[PDB]
Symmetry: C5
Subunit: 347 residues, 5 copies
């Protein structure tokens, strides 16, 4: 993730111009290789036309150039690319919203799972750790960065998310499917035990805990579903073929022809297809943004900070339910007990 929200807080005279100087997360970084390849093929064709081909071959090449310039418009590149990019961006933001966060759960646990003794600390810490462990399991399933951080379950155990007895129980479970859900079942069982023990003081608190657990588990499952059900491969293939075929057609039909032949709209030889290069920049860049966003759990610059989120979530959960439990400041009268640096339209 490359944040620039502060740089654009106000609409200024040089508003988005200063963002053109950024390299990390930029279009230049994603596109300079493809732009160089396109320019190289174009200049190879141009050099062949200018220096290699004979006169009759040049006339045939000019006819082919005019033909391909005229009929390259039949490719619905904008049509297919717009549909694809809209689909990808919608999936991208939805996938970000699907990352499980322990904040609601840690608030409920701190308010509902009681006891200053070691057993209450154990209960709260273990419930939050089960939530974090489910998040880690699904994230290493769906994110290449998290997988590189946790390539084995041994790594997860060594990171403190799973104990060794829990590891024995986890691997002893007979299932051929992804086991990210197992800590959620552990959470339900442990919450039931805590309620039966009296650590959870009422059935409504247990119900609230289970509801928040199910929200968290639903987010994990939604991450799994997005990972499994890709954007349909046929759409990806079609948009890739549209871009490729259109720009090969442009490699042919955007060539500068000899102005001495008097071809219409061919009388200025600039030797560099600046507008064709710009059009490639925009269309291929749109496709590259979809390429980067289609799996936001990879290791692109603008891909989500999954490992950072894991660390933040674990630290904040443990702070909230262990250090902060029953640790309020004394009830104090505030400053305005006895009370800077629109009403409506029709009034």
């Amino acid at each position: 993730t490359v944040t620039y929200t502060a740089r654009v807080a106000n609409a200024r005279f040089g508003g988005f111009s200063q963002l053109l100087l950024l390299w990390r997360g930029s279009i230049y970084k994603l596109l300079w290789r493809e732009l160089l390849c396109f320019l190289g093929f174009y200049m190879a064709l141009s050099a062949a036309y200018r220096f290699v081909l004979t006169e009759g071959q040049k006339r045939y090449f000019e006819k082919l150039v005019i033909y391909c310039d005229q009929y390259a418009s039949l490719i619905p590149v904008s049509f297919v690319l717009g549909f694809y990019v809209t689909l990808v961006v919608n999936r991208w933001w939805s996938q970000y919203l699907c990352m499980p966060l322990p904040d609601a759960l840690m608030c409920v646990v701190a308010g509902t799972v009681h006891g200053r003794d070691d057993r209450g600390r154990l209960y709260r810490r273990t419930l939050m750790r089960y939530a974090g462990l489910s998040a880690v399991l699904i994230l290493r399933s769906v994110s290449t960065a998290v997988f590189k951080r946790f390539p084995t379950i041994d790594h997860v155990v060594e990171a403190g998310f799973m104990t060794r007895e829990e590891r024995k129980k986890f691997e002893n479970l007979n299932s051929s499917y992804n086991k990210y859900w197992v800590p959620c079942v552990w959470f339900s069982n442990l919450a039931a035990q805590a309620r039966r023990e009296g650590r959870i003081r009422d059935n409504s608190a247990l119900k609230l805990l289970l509801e928040e657990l199910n929200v968290f588990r639903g987010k994990c499952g939604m991450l799994f579903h997005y990972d499994w059900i890709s954007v349909p491969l046929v759409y990806t293939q079609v948009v890739t073929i549209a871009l490729y075929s259109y720009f090969l057609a442009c490699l042919i039909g955007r060539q500068f022809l000899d102005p001495a032949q008097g071809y219409k709209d061919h009388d200025l030889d600039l030797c560099v297809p600046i507008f064709t290069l710009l059009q490639f920049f925009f269309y291929a860049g749109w496709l590259k943004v979809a390429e980067q966003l289609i799996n936001p759990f990879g290791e692109d610059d603008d891909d989500f900070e999954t490992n950072f989120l894991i660390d933040r979530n674990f630290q904040v959960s443990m702070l909230a339910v262990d250090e902060m439990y029953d640790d309020l400041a004394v009830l104090e009268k505030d400053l305005y007990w006895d009370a800077y640096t629109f009403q409506g339209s029709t009034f």
Copy 2:
């Protein structure tokens, strides 16, 4: 479902090019027959024009070709196809989200339906099996693959989803409508019996069970509703007619005319309508993707893995509520009891 999420985790230089070599779930697999038929008709017309027709017939054919090339644009193919494909894709993802999953229910059941004896196991297993049975009934109603797997209720009984006494009760029920909802009513009655027996320890736990059951049942009903209320037949007919009429018009108007006649934009005979073939590829492929996605419960490559989901859901449910019930590891102090391979914009 053809997953390629890992292949596109990062935006690479050969980003989507390597996906063009895939055959299963590809545009080539869905479109090669139609492309061959279009090319065959085009070449039949071209051969007739080149070898069969007389000179005056050729002149009339050339006039007709110019006319149809000019006025084929009056067909709003892009207009109708874009609307249709957007509608289909939205319905497709919504339908995937409507498939019932037992994960929330299994967590609630494991946390709320109690007893290590055989009767508690029976309660938990039977509740999860009722959920799975409702899912199977609606899926065999709406999915051709699931129907081929369960062509009769006898098959459902032999798969273990329904017992024979339950089969007698099920077929003895007098209804002319789909009975997918019956196991949900069985679930409500059994949950009430469990609460009355004391296996469910509180009324809030029963309420949570019923709420999750109603979420599951609503997903089953939404599957039924999507199956019943098709995309309006008139839209399908209109987009099919638009594509067909436009490409018959192109079969006429994209023909290569004799360059000796000096017709404008007709001076290069390439003998193969490469750009017309590409345009057919893209437009007919868009329509074929809608065709494949319109019923995502069939047996296309990218159709949903309904039978796999049935098997996974049943196995995971039975694991969660029977093997994993009250089977926690002992409460253990974690690694960070005494504590790898952004704050905000305005700060």
Copy 3:
């Protein structure tokens, strides 16, 4: 509703071609009269030009034809029609989702309203009947088919949805507004009485009943709101005028002119405006689909099966809460007590 979901389960070679042979719910059925009228006016104009008008009148008519062919594009028909049709289709699916269903309520009632005696049956049956009666009242308010089935409240009483004492109470209520909500208030009062009687065993069950009742009542009210707040009349008028004016302009400007005059793009007299007829087919058909979908509660082929849904809902509700109450098969060990015809991307 004309369902064809099974016919399109798989994307086949003759995928959507076989749907072109359907008549019920088809574009041909909705559009053949308008297409005939357009063709008749076109041929009347063509006959007048070919046989009636003098030479100077023909020259003026040709100038007018060229003018209207050129400047008919100034009408933003595609612009207005696309907006209108998207709005209509979104409202259409939302309206289908707003039809009240008793399934959640019948599950809750079967699980919460208890007693095998006649009084418990009376309670459950009456609660489900109040829900069904509210649905019937709003549906006959908003659906012409349901109104034809229930043109008076006497018809509703004779159908068994309302008793005669309930009819006296209902008509004795002093209100000038639609009374569809009255059975929902009856439902709340009866649920409160059942809880006070002990038939509902706990306050959380009563709360769940009231929440599901409020979901049902909200769906009825949303049906009323969609019926009241039409698509803005000005949009309907504007799109109708756009279509009409554009196609009158085409009646003028698509006429075949005498090829002997050497007008550009006028040298082939086909005598039948096949592409203009196709364009009318597509644009007027789009408008006709919006026309049919704008009120999905009428008696069009693809309009919702409201009376079928009423009958199904009543039958299923009465089955669920009366025949199926406390009628479980004995708890039996399933087939897999001692256990046919993807893990993740980063693994």
Copy 4:
């Protein structure tokens, strides 16, 4: 609101033609003045060109007309207008859904706030009146029609929504912000008092009451938010300027030039820019529909019936919670105790 839902229940041969004869809520009513002004300016320019200007001035005017006809397309009128109108329509339907309705609250109150004596009637009536009063306060804040009906709080008191003691408490509250929320706090306090008194029999009923109250209050607040956060003024200014500049350009460039000069596409003087008038009709009408819908709480024909809704809501609430409380017909066996005027795709 101008309802025509019944007129379009079925797609008929004269489907939308009969809606063109309506005047209230029509495009003609909203647009005839602007259309007359545009036509008057056009005819003033045409008269000046035809009768006033000299020959050289006519030649310069013709050159200017050709220039402005060519380059008026550079104004992205369709681009900006489509975005703006989509935004406005989405906000419009969302704003309608945000109007608070007391139906859920009246059902809950009738089912939960008990007592046939005068005190129970007082409780139920006062709770529903607090809800209605909050609705009235926010509506007179946001709706000009409701403000004209209630220009002072004295008018609200005289309408029976607020008592005089409540008026003293209301105006004695020290706040510079809109006080629409005050009756909701009164509602919470009164519900707590009723529960403490025993009129509300259980804590779950109180919780349900507070949840429905918070839904109602959230709808009131959402009305306030929509009133405050307008569609960004810069979008309104930009679309207004786009329309105005484009149609001034058309006033210049759509003028009929002397056909004797042989200007291309200028050889038929119709003296009336029928297609330009139609284009103005459609584009300016689109803008006028956005103008009417942007504040749906004004006094346009298609603006919401806010005062009617206030009256209906108050009457129905008082009927539901006072006249209908504990006023059920005796539990009676229905007609089908001993039982007119689709199963699935894969079956």
Copy 5:
């Protein structure tokens, strides 16, 4: 925020014309500098062409002007700008809806946290202050205006949102991440203490309090998420480059050429590119609106009134839970105890 909702309550003859005279929040204010710069560069180029260049240089410049006028259309400015602006506007309204409001919480607290003594006042005031403090912490994290108002935590303490003992606890918490969530954990702990003390009379009231707290905390977290996950930098760069390159191309290709050369569509020298200036106005203004809306928490005219909302929320919360607690007017019979200044379609 620049509200003009009242000015557009009705669609009037001078409907949006009167909004063109506004300066604050206007397009003129956001765009006059860029428009002046574009016009200055255009006139510099025009002066060079008219007065500086030689005849052969003029001919080459004219050829370049024609080339750039023709091929500047290859830049998909409308394509990229429309996508970007739609994304920005959707994020903008979602971000407004994400601002936390204490209204639901203050209603619940006033109805559930009891006691007229000083301790009950302390409880209610402190809970509402914790909510407000969480809102302030996240807002100063995400909003530059709120940060300028609260550049240090000392400023927050001096504003009364945080006490000094709470400040010691807050800074003593060991975390490297944003601590906006800490007052929510304080809220949960204090609510648990109040329930254990008997100030909260039932477990369902505590559950409702925790649910509303979690809604509030989720809104704060969603503000953090929107601040962190910017609109992808590559989209911003691409749209900025598209606009810039297109309008530099127009600086070249919109130049008025010498009409004596007889270039087609170059025969009227107006010396001022009025239509090019208008096109720049619209396209660059669209981009500037996205620029202003992309971070709606800055200090633009139409940016949200975050500090006003902070003050309003705190004042209203303290009024609702302290001044208004258990302060009802006596239950009084209303005016209509013994009872001004549509039924359905199918009836």
